[PDB]
Amino acid sequence: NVKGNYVQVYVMLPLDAVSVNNRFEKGDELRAQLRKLVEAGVDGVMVDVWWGLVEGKGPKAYDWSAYKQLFELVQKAGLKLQAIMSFHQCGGNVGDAVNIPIPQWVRDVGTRDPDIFYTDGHGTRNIEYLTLGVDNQPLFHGRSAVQMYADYMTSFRENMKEFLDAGVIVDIEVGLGPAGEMRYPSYPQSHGWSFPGIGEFICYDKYLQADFKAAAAAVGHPEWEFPNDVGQYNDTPERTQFFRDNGTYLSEKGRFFLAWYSNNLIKHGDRILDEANKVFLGYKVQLAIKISGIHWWYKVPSHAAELTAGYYNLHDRDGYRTIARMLKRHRASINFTCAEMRDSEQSSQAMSAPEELVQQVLSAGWREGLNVACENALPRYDPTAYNTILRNARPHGINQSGPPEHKLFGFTYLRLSNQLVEGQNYANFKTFVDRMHANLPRDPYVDPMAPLPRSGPEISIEMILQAAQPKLQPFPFQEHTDLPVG
Numbered sequence: 001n002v003k004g005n006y007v008q009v010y011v012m013l014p015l016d017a018v019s020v021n022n023r024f025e026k027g028d029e030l031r032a033q034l035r036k037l038v039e040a041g042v043d044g045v046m047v048d049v050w051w052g053l054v055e056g057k058g059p060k061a062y063d064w065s066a067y068k069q070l071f072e073l074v075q076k077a078g079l080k081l082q083a084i085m086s087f088h089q090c091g092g093n094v095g096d097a098v099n100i101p102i103p104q105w106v107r108d109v110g111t112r113d114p115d116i117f118y119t120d121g122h123g124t125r126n127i128e129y130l131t132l133g134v135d136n137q138p139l140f141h142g143r144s145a146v147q148m149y150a151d152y153m154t155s156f157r158e159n160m161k162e163f164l165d166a167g168v169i170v171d172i173e174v175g176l177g178p179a180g181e182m183r184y185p186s187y188p189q190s191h192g193w194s195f196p197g198i199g200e201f202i203c204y205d206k207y208l209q210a211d212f213k214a215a216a217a218a219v220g221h222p223e224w225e226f227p228n229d230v231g232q233y234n235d236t237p238e239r240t241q242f243f244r245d246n247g248t249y250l251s252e253k254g255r256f257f258l259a260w261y262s263n264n265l266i267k268h269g270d271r272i273l274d275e276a277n278k279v280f281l282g283y284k285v286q287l288a289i290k291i292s293g294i295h296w297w298y299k300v301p302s303h304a305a306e307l308t309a310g311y312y313n314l315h316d317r318d319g320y321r322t323i324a325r326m327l328k329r330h331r332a333s334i335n336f337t338c339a340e341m342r343d344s345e346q347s348s349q350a351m352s353a354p355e356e357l358v359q360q361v362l363s364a365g366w367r368e369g370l371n372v373a374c375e376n377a378l379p380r381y382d383p384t385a386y387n388t389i390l391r392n393a394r395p396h397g398i399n400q401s402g403p404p405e406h407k408l409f410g411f412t413y414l415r416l417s418n419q420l421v422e423g424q425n426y427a428n429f430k431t432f433v434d435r436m437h438a439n440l441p442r443d444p445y446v447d448p449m450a451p452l453p454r455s456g457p458e459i460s461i462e463m464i465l466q467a468a469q470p471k472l473q474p475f476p477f478q479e480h481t482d483l484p485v486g
C-alpha cells in the first residue's frame, strides 16, 4: 500500500489571473487551461491575492469581486486552492510579467515619510513592500502595517467563507516581503543588482536604524553602526573585508549585526503569523510562509547572499532551523523553492549549491515537526527537472507498506501558461504528476486538515535561536529518484 507516498501537486496561476484593473477577464482561457490540469490529475492551484488590486481605492475599501469569480471557477473545476496574501508589488523580481503595485494611498504616506520603505546604504528606497520597521507604527491613516495585513486577511475570510467551508481554499500563504518572500530586497534586479552579486543589507530606513541603535545600546555599545566594509550589490565576497574568508562577519560586531538583521525578519514573521492565526482560527487550512532560495554563495564561508537576504546561515549556524522553530507554535508550514535545480546546472562563479540548500531547509523544517512544501525556482519543462523535484519530494524514495520517513507535504509548479499544457511539455508534466502521486489517481480526500488551533505561547528570540547550534547534518537524500518520469 503506497498511498502514504502521494505528494500533492499544485500549479501557480498566471500573475494576472485577475487583471491589473481588478477584473476577472481571462476566465474562459483559464477554464480551458484548468481542464488540461484536471486531465493531468493536479490537486489544485495557487494564486496571488494582490493587496494593490483589492484595497486599491482607499482604507478598508475592499473589492473582492474579481477574486470571488476566480475562486468560483476553480471550485467548479474540482480543484483546491492555495491563496497567497500578496502584500507586495508584482514587477521588479525575476519572471515578473505584469505590474501591480501596493495600494497608491499607502504609497502616498511615503511622500511625507519615505522611511516606510526598505532603504539601502545609498539611500535608495524600494517601493515594493513596507519595511518591517513600520509593522507596529500607526502611520497609515491611524493603522500600522500589521493592522492593515490583519484587516485584509479578516475581510478575505469573511468574503471567502463559503470557499473555506466547502474545502476549496486549503492553504493561506502569508506574504512577508518582496515577491511574497520572508526576506529583505537585497538583490534588486532592475535597480543595480545582477546575478550572482552578493547583494546589500537593506536596513537603512530610519525605523530600522533607530531599532539597531536601541539594540546596540542595550548591550552597552551605543556607538556601533552598521558595517561599512560590505562593498556593493555586484561585488563578490573577496572584494570586501566583511564577507571575505576570515573577514569581519566573524567579529563580535559582525555577529551582533547579522543576528539583529536576521532576528528582525524572524520577529516580523512571528508577529504577522500570530495575527493570521487569529484570523483563520477554526478553519481547515494551513498557514504557510515562503522562504527565498538564495543558492548563490552557499559554497563560500560567508554565505554572503543569504546574509544580505536576511538568512544568517553559516557552516556552524543553522539560519533556517531558527525560522522553522519560530513557525512551530503557529503550526505553520515552510514553502521553499529550488526543488528542480541540480548543482551541475549552475555556473561555477556563482558558488551555488541549491541541492544542499534544499536539503538543509527541508531537514530543518522536519526537525521542528513542520510540514514542508516546495516550488521550482525557474521555468522548466524537461524530464530531468521533474526527476530532481521527485527526488526532493521523497528523499528516501517509496515506502512500499506505509508513509515514507520524510516527504514534501506538497509541491507547487511555477507556473501555468499555454506553453505548459500543450505538446511535449504537457506530456512530461502529466507523467510527473503521476509519479508525484506514486502512480495513483488523484485523491480529493488526501491530507485532510483539522480546524486550525490557536498558536502556542510566544517564545523569545533567545529561545528561537537555540535552534541555530549545533548545526546538524541533513537527513540523507537519494542521488536520484526511484520513480522517475521515464
Ligand SMILES: *[C@H]1O[C@H]1CO[C@H]1O[C@H](CO)[C@@H](O)[C@H](O)[C@H]1O
Pocket: 012, 015, 048, 084, 086, 089, 090, 091, 093, 094, 095, 096, 179, 180, 181, 292, 337, 377
Ligand atoms: C520569489 O520564488 C519567487 C516567486 O515570486 C514570483 O511568484 C510569486 C507567486 O506567483 C509572486 O508573488 C511574486 O511576485 C513573483 O515574483
